[PDB]
Amino acid sequence: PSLEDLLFYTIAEGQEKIPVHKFITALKSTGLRTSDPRLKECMDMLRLTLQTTSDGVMLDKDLFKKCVQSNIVLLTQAFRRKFVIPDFMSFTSHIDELYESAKKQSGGKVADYIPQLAKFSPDLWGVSVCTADGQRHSTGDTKVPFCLQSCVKPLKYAIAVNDLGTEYVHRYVGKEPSGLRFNKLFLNEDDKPHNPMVNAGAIVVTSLIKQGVNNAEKFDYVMQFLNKMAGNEYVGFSNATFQSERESGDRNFAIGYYLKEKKCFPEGTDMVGILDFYFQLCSIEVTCESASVMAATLANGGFCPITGERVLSPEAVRNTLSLMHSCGMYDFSGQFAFHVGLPAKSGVAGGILLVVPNVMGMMCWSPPLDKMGNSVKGIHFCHDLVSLCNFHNYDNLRHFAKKLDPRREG
Amino acid sequence: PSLEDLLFYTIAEGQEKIPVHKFITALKSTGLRTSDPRLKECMDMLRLTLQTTSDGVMLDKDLFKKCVQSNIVLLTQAFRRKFVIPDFMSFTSHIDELYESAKKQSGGKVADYIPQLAKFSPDLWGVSVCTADGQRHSTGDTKVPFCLQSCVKPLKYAIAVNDLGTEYVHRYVGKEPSGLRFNKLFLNEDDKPHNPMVNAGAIVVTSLIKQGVNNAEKFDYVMQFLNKMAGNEYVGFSNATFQSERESGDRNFAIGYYLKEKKCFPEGTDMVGILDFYFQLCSIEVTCESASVMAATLANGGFCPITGERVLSPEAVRNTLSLMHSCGMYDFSGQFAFHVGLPAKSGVAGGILLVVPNVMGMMCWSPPLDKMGNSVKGIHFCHDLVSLCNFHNYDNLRHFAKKLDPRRE
Amino acid sequence: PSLEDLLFYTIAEGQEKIPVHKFITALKSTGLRTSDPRLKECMDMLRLTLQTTSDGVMLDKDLFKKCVQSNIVLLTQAFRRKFVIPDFMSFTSHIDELYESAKKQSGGKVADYIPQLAKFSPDLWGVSVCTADGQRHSTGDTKVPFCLQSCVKPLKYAIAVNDLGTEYVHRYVGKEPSGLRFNKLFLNEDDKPHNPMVNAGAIVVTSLIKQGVNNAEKFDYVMQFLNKMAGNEYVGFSNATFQSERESGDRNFAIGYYLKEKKCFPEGTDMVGILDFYFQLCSIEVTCESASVMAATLANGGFCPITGERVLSPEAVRNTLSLMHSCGMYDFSGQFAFHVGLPAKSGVAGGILLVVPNVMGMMCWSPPLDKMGNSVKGIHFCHDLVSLCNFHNYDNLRHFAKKLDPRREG
Amino acid sequence: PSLEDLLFYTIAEGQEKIPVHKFITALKSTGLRTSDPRLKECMDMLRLTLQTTSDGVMLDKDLFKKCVQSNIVLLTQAFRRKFVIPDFMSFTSHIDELYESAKKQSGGKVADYIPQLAKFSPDLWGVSVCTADGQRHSTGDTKVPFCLQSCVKPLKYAIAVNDLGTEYVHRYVGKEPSGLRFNKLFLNEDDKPHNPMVNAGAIVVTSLIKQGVNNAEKFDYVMQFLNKMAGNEYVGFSNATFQSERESGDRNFAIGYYLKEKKCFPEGTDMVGILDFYFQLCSIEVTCESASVMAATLANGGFCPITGERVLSPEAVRNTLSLMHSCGMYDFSGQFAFHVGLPAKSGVAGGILLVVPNVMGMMCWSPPLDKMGNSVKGIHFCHDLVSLCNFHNYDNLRHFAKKLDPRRE
Numbered sequence A, C: 001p002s003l004e005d006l007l008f009y010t011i012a013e014g015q016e017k018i019p020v021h022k023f024i025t026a027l028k029s030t031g032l033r034t035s036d037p038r039l040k041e042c043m044d045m046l047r048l049t050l051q052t053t054s055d056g057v058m059l060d061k062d063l064f065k066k067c068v069q070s071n072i073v074l075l076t077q078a079f080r081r082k083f084v085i086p087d088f089m090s091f092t093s094h095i096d097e098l099y100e101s102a103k104k105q106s107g108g109k110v111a112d113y114i115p116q117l118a119k120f121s122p123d124l125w126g127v128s129v130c131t132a133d134g135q136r137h138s139t140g141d142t143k144v145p146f147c148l149q150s151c152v153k154p155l156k157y158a159i160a161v162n163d164l165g166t167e168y169v170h171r172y173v174g175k176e177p178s179g180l181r182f183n184k185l186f187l188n189e190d191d192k193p194h195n196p197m198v199n200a201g202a203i204v205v206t207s208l209i210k211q212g213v214n215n216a217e218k219f220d221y222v223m224q225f226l227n228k229m230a231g232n233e234y235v236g237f238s239n240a241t242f243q244s245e246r247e248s249g250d251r252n253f254a255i256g257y258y259l260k261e262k263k264c265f266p267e268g269t270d271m272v273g274i275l276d277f278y279f280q281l282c283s284i285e286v287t288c289e290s291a292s293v294m295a296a297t298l299a300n301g302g303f304c305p306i307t308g309e310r311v312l313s314p315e316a317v318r319n320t321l322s323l324m325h326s327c328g329m330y331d332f333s334g335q336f337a338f339h340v341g342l343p344a345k346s347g348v349a350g351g352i353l354l355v356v357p358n359v360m361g362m363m364c365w366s367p368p369l370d371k372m373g374n375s376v377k378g379i380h381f382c383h384d385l386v387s388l389c390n391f392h393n394y395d396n397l398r399h400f401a402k403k404l405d406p407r408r409e410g
Numbered sequence B, D: 001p002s003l004e005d006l007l008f009y010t011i012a013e014g015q016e017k018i019p020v021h022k023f024i025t026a027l028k029s030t031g032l033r034t035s036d037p038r039l040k041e042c043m044d045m046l047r048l049t050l051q052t053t054s055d056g057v058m059l060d061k062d063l064f065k066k067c068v069q070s071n072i073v074l075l076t077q078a079f080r081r082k083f084v085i086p087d088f089m090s091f092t093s094h095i096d097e098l099y100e101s102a103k104k105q106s107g108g109k110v111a112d113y114i115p116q117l118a119k120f121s122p123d124l125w126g127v128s129v130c131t132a133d134g135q136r137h138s139t140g141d142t143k144v145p146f147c148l149q150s151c152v153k154p155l156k157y158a159i160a161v162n163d164l165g166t167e168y169v170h171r172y173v174g175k176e177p178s179g180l181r182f183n184k185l186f187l188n189e190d191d192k193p194h195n196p197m198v199n200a201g202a203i204v205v206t207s208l209i210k211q212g213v214n215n216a217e218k219f220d221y222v223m224q225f226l227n228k229m230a231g232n233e234y235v236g237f238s239n240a241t242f243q244s245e246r247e248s249g250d251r252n253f254a255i256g257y258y259l260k261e262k263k264c265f266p267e268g269t270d271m272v273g274i275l276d277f278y279f280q281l282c283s284i285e286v287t288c289e290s291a292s293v294m295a296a297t298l299a300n301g302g303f304c305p306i307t308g309e310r311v312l313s314p315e316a317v318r319n320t321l322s323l324m325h326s327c328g329m330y331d332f333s334g335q336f337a338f339h340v341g342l343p344a345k346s347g348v349a350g351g352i353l354l355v356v357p358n359v360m361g362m363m364c365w366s367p368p369l370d371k372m373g374n375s376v377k378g379i380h381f382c383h384d385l386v387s388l389c390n391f392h393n394y395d396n397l398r399h400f401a402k403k404l405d406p407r408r409e
């Protein structure tokens, strides 16, 4: 027997040779993107034989064997329905409906405190999915760059725990939510910030990453890291947003000094310098698509799903998801944890980084925020998604009532 | 082909006939207990034929099929290792290691606030498991009855949400935790108690269950409900514990009166009676074993695993596990949710009712409490369990480092 | 020489005999009331000679000497303008103006949570003055009985420290105000109520007065005490108010149980009985006139000014004035101390018991309360009073700008 | 008859001529200092006459009248015991006892966070009095200059209310104390600092004084203002303290940035400059003697008692005495108001500027502080002072038990 050969008969349909487009659309219908890095050898060989023989465009058992041999393990799982969402075409149909249902929630106010997010239109709205297996789907304004802002706080924490361990990082920052009107305090009772998703704890976590090196190499260190998470999709940097964040951050300058007085930073910290590195990290740019790969990396126990690369330790990813559950959505965290039950993180540009552990990661984006600071459409989408699918943290995988389960088939 | 016949050769091992004891030990090793209610029919036919011919005790293809046809699907799943933990024999060996490792933590102080918990010895310690499929195992003092106390709070919240729905119950109680030094407040800013796991909200939740009937019928209704949840295993009641909570509950009278003044109960409430009903509910008795079935009922989306009965709506169970995750372990809730990541609920008699969703439910019991109020051995066990198995809520099921996974082979 | 003889020529106005009405009007104009207990002998002797010599009504040097001998010291000080307010006639004209200026502030809501405080008309308004010397003046509805309610807290605190001393009493109750959003807390951080003017602390103090005896003698012990303080003017008791306060006091029962749990009472306290005794003390009745004598006794270092009787130790009065200054007007305490600067206490019936140390006591009464719980007209009257006179605690007795000083003349 | 003549016989004692020393000693025993500014003409004429007739040194009815006519009303009041404390010689004997009783309380820790307050000896200790009439007395280290630090907060609040009025100033700062552990907060619920005695509110008040002018002239205005208040006694500036206060005042920058974000300042303020101006004001230097005259100006309705000039409006003095009563001694404020009953203000150098309204002002100084931040010897002295004299705010001026009253004979 032979794996390349048995896969050949599945797509051959008893016939003699497979047209290339018939193989291409069969492969794309699994949700894989024809530009998947795990598929580069297969696609390079296909492009070559489509030159070598204008005499086509048909592959026999032996010619198909030449192309798919290099990536046969991933292609077989994709064609024999072994992916975490087996019927991806029906699932994306559902994502499209949920998107259109949220597209009608036109309330909210765009963050206006800086001219660079006031520039963004309230009609933008996109959602990108990326499963723990690499299946992609987008709808809407998903290639528009926008800043992570507070969406970057869980990614920084993951990098800090990945490099320093849990016990070290949690000398300097706590692990609990604060309480629905302890939002205005910087420190909990141990004179540590309450947790990494809070501004005071985000700043302290920022002062742990790559100490001893200067602000240019730290920024390089974190961006190289964010590239691995996104399978080398778009990660950028807005100097416009950063220069404004620098000139309008009196609240954070207040935090920095209060943290200096109470000896919250590591010894030898340049507090004002850490504030620049902090403002920088909030001005990193993503699209919906590139961020949906980041979120899926946390969804996937730390391995980027479109490269197979190990990016974060299981200890760093578990801690980040734990803190996104309960501290992730500003004052909505408690209500969100109850009704949605997913690790999520919101931002002022309109991002919501959403992780369905063991299934997929997502990024929703609509600039207009409601009064607690979360994208109006994004929050609507997240409620709708969990009403439809048994992805809630404490839904049952066996007795889930009237919800659909995309991890099953019939 | 034939499903009863194929199982016969599976356990017969090509041989002539199955001894009766060889079938029972084969069955017990799947984790099923020979008294499972879903197996009563099979066990009745065995009880009949073990009289029919003392010239035995051997079952032919036809005689084995005589007993097992009634329960063949459940027996096939158990023998083709389709149960949520396929190698149950090995997993219980690990539970024994974790139990013995916690048995050496003799620190802590027994709750003495009532003479009925001061009389319980610091040497007691039991652990019971019940998987979403019915596989059972116990170690230690697992049949000694004890009161739930605050372990009962998630169970009554489930009943209330099961009968009245989420929107109603949460007109009267919040959904968030309060904050690590907001423990001393009764109400949040919307004038509802913070959540059903704290005393002020447990008191309010109690005033919602089965309104319009008197306190004796209310209590009977909750006992009937707690019976369905434990697959009819041990549920009792201590009149002694009830009398001491009654005569020493000035704090609960303080809460009750504060809630009456700020109009937190549903209209037509006899506040003083509801405290009596509340004190009663805290004095319900369980054993480790019976409660581990209750926990598995939450683990199993609302269906009791040793009877298959639908006991709670999926909405009541999802809400209860949500609120146990973040509010279940007193001031330890935050540290606990981070490190263990399992919905749990603790009590002052020393209980910790523990849920691993889609896998199993658990009950630990050791009377000596730490300074935050949680059983010392019980907390030690929960850390060790999650350190060993990828049961943490935000462990990944595919890339889980050097932890063991009891769901695979 | 002779005091009876020189006071004789003071009123004689060079003629030979004094009409009786001419002496009485001279006496009333000092503000003394012709029924002052320190004047009983003089008034009895005057009424007697108006029977024995109907051939009058005129008194010579020797007949004047017959009547005023007994109370000549009090009469001389009154006639030689030696009283704390020498020109009482002019001062009462001002009290009348201040009264009329507040009669025009008809806002507020009468307290309605029990039927007997809702029954009071919103148009009642009275104010009574009583100096440390006994000079009286009233305007408005000054003889209508009403309940003290929270006005009783400074009087029972004074009774407790008069019998037990400060250090004993302040084992069970603090001495500071709480902070404008520590209002809902019962205990401070030492597990004592914050101070005697708050409900939780008034209840605890009630549990220190006259321990070991039952509720009837306790009530008698306190009423006799209030009688001495008011120079035997009207002190009464509403059983109606007590019955409604009792069956509608769920927060006070809430306080009682919380205080039992945290062991705030003395050993052997019958907590529910102390709540009965507390409700009773809140339903004791006064009129404006009778309550204004109470206030002056605190103004007067503990000596009731119309009987000369020592009623409270100087330690008890100093402490009670200290706490009325900072805790007496509910959430208005800080604003009141700042702008009025007088020891004062308010109640839900509409009373404000007011003390100007070393000068006078006062009681204002108008049932309509403002949104913090204080009589609207009463608070208005207090601001007006101190804008007019240098009575504010930290006004200067020498350089007081354009304010009037009733303690001086020209 | 004649005012200069009757005064002459008062001190002449029927004799022929008054020696010069006999008059100077008579004058000092009234407590006036032979250098009072209100006595300059009289002392100039004495210094003028002490040269012409070295064949003296004794004054006739006419030569005494030569000098004293210019200041006759002040001298007569002092000699017919019309001063607020008629028997000053006996009163200072009592302050000497109180000083000596506190000198035996050697506990406390000198402020260490800057090298300029660690340099001061733990055994320095001074007390100075100055009455509303100008009678002076000191015991101890009363001419050693030290920084006001937070003692300057009431003086600048007074300047601000004196120049702009109460309604304007209290748009930017509240008027209550905060709550015994609401100390860690900067703003109340109205987004104003709680009151001027607090760091967050002193910072805001600093931003209202003389707006629109630069930091050098602003500082000159405040020094000119402090000079009128101390009757031109010693006021200085420590540049060392100012350099260390700015280079270690991270909490103050935290306050400034938080106050800037919540728009607490008036329009057009350079927040970073106002922190410099604030640090400067905290480094103003005084001695015990000079600062107690400042206190006497507050005691005296705004008129400096040793020059007679009006320095502050009565509205400003009342408000500052109001806020010093309740906020002046950090976490000790409530306790202090209850037990001492005097408006006072403390500072980290160890000063306590204390006001007994309508009688006298005071300044105590001993560097070793409490754990709440107040001078130990200074706090002890204030308690002792009020146990002795009926100066407590709510003492009775008529029925005051066994306490002494320095205002009577």
Ligand SMILES: CC(=O)Nc1nnc(OC2CCN(c3nnc(NC(C)=O)s3)CC2)s1
Residues within 6 Å of the ligand: A184, A185, A186, A187, A188, A189, A190, A191, A258, D184, D185, D186, D187, D188, D189, D191, D258
């Ligand atoms: C606006 C209002 O009404 N109140 C206020 N809210 N926030 C304010 O800003 C500061 C609060 C004080 N600081 C603290 N952080 N954590 C603390 N707890 C401990 C145990 O250290 S204290 C820094 C921020 S003031």
Ligand SMILES: CC(=O)Nc1nnc(OC2CCN(c3nnc(NC(C)=O)s3)CC2)s1
Residues within 6 Å of the ligand: B184, B185, B186, B187, B188, B189, B258, C184, C185, C186, C187, C188, C189, C258
């Ligand atoms: C720790 C300390 O110093 N004092 C105290 N600690 N606990 C106390 O119990 C009482 C607190 C006051 N009441 C309230 N409950 N919830 C509330 N929430 C809101 C938003 O109003 S207010 C009744 C219980 S007092």
